[model samples]
Target: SVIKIEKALKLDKVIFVDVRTEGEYEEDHILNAINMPLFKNNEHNEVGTIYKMQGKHEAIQKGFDYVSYKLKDIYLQAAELALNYDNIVIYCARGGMRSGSIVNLLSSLGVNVYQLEGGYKAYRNFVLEY
Candidate 1:
């Protein structure tokens, strides 16, 4: 389900997709990471705020509402990558639901998908230490 970055790198034709907000990807991300943001910058913030003020369920509902319409585009983008790569590796801020959900979706569509075990945060830690 989840693969460490070190092992992920060793895989042949691996595709790394960053599912965080555009701002987060802009701030810092793995090399050659495709920006397939699960939520736009503002939408991400809105979900975060809702999570804080309303709760996880409310936040999830809002996130779903925001992303449901974009599923076609997201799937098309990932399918495009699938055409070129043997493995699809996805990450968000942490190895959380955003990446996990997409991994599941892609896998269901017959793409070999994996999640970065600790997401971009873990990747950054490895890069810094190395």
Candidate 2:
């Protein structure tokens, strides 16, 4: 359910979405997570560089542009998922920026989207620690 932080996808309640880059996702990702790469490899790498070297705003501007353009496709996918389920739960590597952007876009389109607050990292942590 939307109320659960570790809610795994089911037929009606939730649909899992992996918004990480294709490479990272290919390595390993959640079961049933639809691969909707929000930030591509090149763009993600560029943003990471900025986060380390330049600053937050610099990375955020580029991320905003990248996600802004890709939102329509994401919205469509999310809408479809939402029709089948109550909540579309999305996540990325750290559940930080990529999924957050898509979650916002889906929200704007009036789709109820729940993001994994700490992302896959959190999920992985809980899985291991539990």
List of clashing residue pairs for candidate 2:
none
lDDT of 1: 0.89
Per-candidate clashes come to 0, 0
Compute each candidate's TM-score over C-alphas. 0.94, 0.85
Model 2 Cα lDDT, one tens digit per residue, 38-99: 78899889989988898998989878877777777777877788778876788888867677
Q: Which residue pairs show collisions in model 1?
A: none
Lowest lDDT block of 10, candidate 2: 1-10
Off by over 4 Å in 1: none
User: What lDDT is reached at residue 74 by model 2?
Assistant: 76
lDDT for every model? 0.89, 0.76
Query: Whole-model lDDT, candidate 2?
Result: 0.76
